[PDB]
Amino acid sequence: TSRRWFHPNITGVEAENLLLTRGVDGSFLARPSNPGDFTLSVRRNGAVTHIKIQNTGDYYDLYGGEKFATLAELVQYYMEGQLKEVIELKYPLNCADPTSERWFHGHLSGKEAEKLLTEKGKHGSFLVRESQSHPGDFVLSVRTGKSKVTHVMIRCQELKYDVGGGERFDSLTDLVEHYKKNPMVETLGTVLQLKQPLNTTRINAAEIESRVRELSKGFWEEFETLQQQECKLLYSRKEGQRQENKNKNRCKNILPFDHTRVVLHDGDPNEPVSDYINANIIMPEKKSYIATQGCLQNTVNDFWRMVFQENSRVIVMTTKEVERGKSKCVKYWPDEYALKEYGVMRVRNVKESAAHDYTLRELKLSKVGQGNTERTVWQYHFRTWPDHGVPSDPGGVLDFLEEVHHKQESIMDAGPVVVHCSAGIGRTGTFIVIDILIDIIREKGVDCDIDVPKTIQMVRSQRSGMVQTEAQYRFIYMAVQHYIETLQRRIEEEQKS
């Protein structure tokens, strides 16, 4: 609901002073860091303790704690155990910095704000900018509708914010949220409804190169604004929390949303719960996906029940079975030319074809004792993804996804494309997002509208924390840039031949 406990522009010593002067025992905050890392600063017995959170691209790993899909899910978990050599998360210490808010521009001038609200904004579209010049003060610009752009002055008096009367707010967020729920009425009756903020992320696919360079001059700020929206995605994950489902999860707290989870049918009456798999259907809002985790040895049979039931013909594997001496995915496919039975399912590995970045396994899947149920399942196993971070060049990933798209398109009545890595959120999220965005450019051509964080947010509403890091976020932009460049180069070559 809030995510006010995250402070994007704070330092170690600044966080300590804040918890000692504005907080009590049990007070906490989360802060970025040596980048790529995060810190949970908690006050206990008049002393401040710092707990390290690392994310290399798979999940948020809290030291002495658990692995989580989002910082918001991490916070919700401990607020609803953390120990030393007992750390309690009781009171979130709220941030007043509005820089990660969608509606906050600041830098914008009166003329520019009006221009953007006219061309991009609609009824209820609003923004907050800095004055302009009554230094320290802020300006709320709102569109209502013939239409009109209304300006409301926000005075900053002794650290508090107000619209000239009534209540005095600790932050611009407290002020905005109050006027969103309780709208301001003008002298002649016009209701200043704050429906949605101004979209500053939607770009034309052809103009990617310019946006990539402007973000390279921005990438971190755009990601954190998207990150600030995860508190709206804390949907129930009850099924995964069930006692009988606990050992079917690779990470106990990285669970599928109940509303999008894959439900397994025709199981076994002897096992009480046979309908669960840590997987979700990803529907872009034609080509759908199943975002899943790497198999555990006790879920390989459920994995095959899923593929068969969902009528999937393409498996996208974005991890090695072993990375840094740790099992990331149990081998669920047989050896080349071998035939294996996985419970009620039978799988034949027909042929293996190796490319530079991946291996293709041609599998034949059927139900045991059931003639005619056989279908070919193509497993594209990407092998070169780095242990930490993302690849330097997206050429290999793009060549891989083009090949995956062509195979999926070549199959009549094919079900969702199964996509998995380790926990099935970071790399899995990255691959599905690139594939969705490239799908738009494939149908609509080089000149179409794309919105990278809007797409990520839609995918994160279907499976927890899809796209884990800023590295992946930037890599998504770099892959879309490389695809448009490669598409234009093909037009260059044809007209010149």
Side-chain angles (χ1 to χ4, degrees):
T1 183
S2 63
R3 213 180 188 259
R4 298 285 305 275
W5 41 261
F6 192 81
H7 301 235
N9 297 290
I10 205 165
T11 69
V13 73
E14 241 167 17
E16 285 190 338
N17 295 346
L18 217 63
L19 287 158
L20 293 158
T21 61
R22 250 167 278 181
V24 294
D25 296 315
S27 276
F28 70 92
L29 67 99
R31 57 190 184 90
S33 202
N34 207 45
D37 264 49
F38 302 92
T39 306
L40 183 67
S41 305
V42 195
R43 188 186 160 165
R44 52 159 302 276
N45 321 126
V48 176
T49 186
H50 302 280
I51 308 103
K52 187 209 93 240
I53 307 161
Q54 60 160 33
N55 197 330
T56 66
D58 304 319
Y59 35 67
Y60 292 92
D61 194 354
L62 179 79
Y63 198 84
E66 276 275 8
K67 285 154 183 177
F68 298 90
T70 81
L71 285 187
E73 286 188 6
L74 188 151
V75 170
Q76 182 191 46
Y77 179 84
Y78 299 107
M79 282 191 82
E80 288 176 15
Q82 270 223 97
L83 324 305
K84 308 264 277 196
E85 51 270 1
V86 193
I87 300 147
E88 308 168 276
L89 302 196
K90 294 185 198 285
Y91 320 101
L93 196 289
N94 300 349
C95 191
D97 188 8
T99 54
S100 293
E101 288 277 54
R102 285 160 80 210
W103 44 256
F104 187 81
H105 297 60
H107 63 271
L108 230 57
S109 64
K111 278 183 139 187
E112 301 317 283
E114 283 183 45
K115 197 216 277 170
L116 288 163
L117 270 166
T118 308
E119 66 196 11
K120 310 268 95 70
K122 60 172 184 176
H123 172 79
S125 298
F126 73 100
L127 69 96
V128 175
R129 56 181 169 98
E130 303 144 20
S131 223
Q132 186 241 212
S133 253
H134 286 156
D137 294 22
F138 294 85
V139 185
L140 169 84
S141 308
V142 205
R143 186 183 159 147
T144 50
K146 199 64 73 192
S147 302
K148 60 145 166 287
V149 171
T150 309
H151 303 95
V152 178
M153 289 153 190
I154 301 162
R155 292 193 77 195
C156 179
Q157 289 175 269
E158 286 293 326
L159 282 302
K160 294 180 186 280
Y161 303 86
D162 64 84
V163 297
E167 214 189 303
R168 275 177 72 214
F169 305 96
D170 287 333
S171 65
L172 279 170
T173 298
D174 291 317
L175 186 142
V176 167
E177 292 309 308
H178 184 88
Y179 297 107
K180 268 175 82 69
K181 210 203 271 191
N182 313 301
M184 282 180 286
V185 186
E186 283 201 291
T187 351
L188 270 137
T190 314
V191 192
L192 301 171
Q193 293 249 33
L194 311 173
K195 279 178 78 190
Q196 19 70 56
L198 190 87
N199 191 293
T200 182
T201 60
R202 185 197 220 182
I203 58 153
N204 198 79
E207 285 209 300
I208 191 109
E209 210 169 312
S210 303
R211 181 56 67 117
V212 164
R213 220 48 54 222
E214 262 285 307
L215 286 166
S216 296
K217 244 100 174 283
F219 273 119
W220 190 90
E221 288 80 0
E222 202 177 73
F223 183 63
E224 289 311 316
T225 302
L226 159 70
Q227 287 303 90
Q228 188 90 304
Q229 307 299 301
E230 64 183 30
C231 271
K232 293 176 183 178
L233 318 163
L234 300 157
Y235 303 119
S236 69
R237 281 158 274 111
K238 267 169 58 62
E239 293 298 316
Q241 280 162 321
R242 278 203 184 144
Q243 207 280 130
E244 40 269 285
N245 289 334
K246 290 194 282 201
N247 293 342
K248 304 165 186 179
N249 301 310
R250 173 165 292 278
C251 306
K252 81 169 219 81
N253 310 120
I254 299 170
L255 308 155
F257 295 132
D258 301 322
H259 75 289
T260 61
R261 76 175 188 100
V262 182
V263 185
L264 302 174
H265 309 106
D266 196 50
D268 198 308
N270 299 113
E271 56 171 317
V273 172
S274 48
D275 81 327
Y276 183 87
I277 191 170
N278 192 321
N280 301 87
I281 297 286
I282 305 305
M283 288 283 179
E285 286 151 71
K286 195 78 254 164
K287 185 134 134 268
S288 60
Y289 318 81
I290 291 164
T292 197
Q293 66 176 26
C295 283
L296 291 166
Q297 72 172 123
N298 64 302
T299 70
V300 174
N301 293 5
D302 294 319
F303 181 82
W304 288 113
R305 282 174 67 213
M306 178 185 65
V307 176
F308 182 90
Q309 177 190 296
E310 292 297 306
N311 192 54
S312 295
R313 314 297 181 94
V314 179
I315 298 165
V316 174
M317 181 169 179
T318 69
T319 187
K320 288 182 186 67
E321 301 169 46
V322 179
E323 280 177 30
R324 297 281 175 92
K326 298 143 200 176
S327 174
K328 302 291 176 185
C329 188
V330 171
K331 182 168 168 120
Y332 59 90
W333 65 89
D335 280 351
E336 193 181 21
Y337 317 116
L339 175 81
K340 250 247 157 74
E341 287 188 19
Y342 300 99
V344 302
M345 301 305 162
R346 198 198 283 112
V347 185
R348 179 185 296 281
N349 177 345
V350 169
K351 194 74 187 77
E352 287 193 14
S353 301
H356 192 75
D357 293 298
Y358 70 99
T359 302
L360 174 68
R361 303 191 178 94
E362 183 185 340
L363 321 168
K364 269 185 165 191
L365 167 67
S366 59
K367 200 175 270 179
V368 298
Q370 282 268 87
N372 285 338
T373 67
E374 200 165 72
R375 86 280 316 278
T376 308
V377 185
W378 307 81
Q379 189 216 34
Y380 286 92
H381 184 184
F382 195 94
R383 295 181 283 102
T384 62
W385 193 280
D387 292 351
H388 292 344
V390 296
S392 301
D393 164 74
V397 162
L398 290 161
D399 204 79
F400 176 76
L401 290 170
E402 204 66 22
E403 196 50 49
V404 166
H405 176 84
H406 295 311
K407 186 67 72 174
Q408 179 64 15
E409 254 215 274
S410 86
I411 307 155
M412 282 182 192
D413 309 302
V417 168
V418 177
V419 184
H420 75 92
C421 54
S422 53
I425 65 180
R427 273 135 87 151
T428 288
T430 300
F431 273 75
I432 287 165
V433 172
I434 291 162
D435 193 72
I436 295 167
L437 298 163
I438 293 329
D439 231 89
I440 295 147
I441 310 146
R442 232 186 242 116
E443 194 207 34
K444 289 179 181 174
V446 289
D447 296 85
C448 62
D449 281 341
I450 62 143
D451 199 327
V452 182
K454 156 104 179 75
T455 304
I456 297 160
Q457 190 67 4
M458 177 268 300
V459 174
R460 281 177 178 180
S461 81
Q462 294 173 86
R463 177 158 176 93
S464 301
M466 297 279 274
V467 176
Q468 281 292 289
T469 57
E470 176 273 336
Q472 289 160 349
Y473 187 86
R474 188 194 284 248
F475 181 86
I476 289 166
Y477 267 96
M478 296 307 282
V480 180
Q481 181 176 247
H482 198 92
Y483 184 81
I484 280 129
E485 255 187 63
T486 219
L487 236 65
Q488 276 291 105
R489 170 88 195 270
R490 262 138 99 266
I491 296 151
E492 262 85 289
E493 285 177 345
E494 179 139 299
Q495 72 126 248
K496 284 185 169 82
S497 61

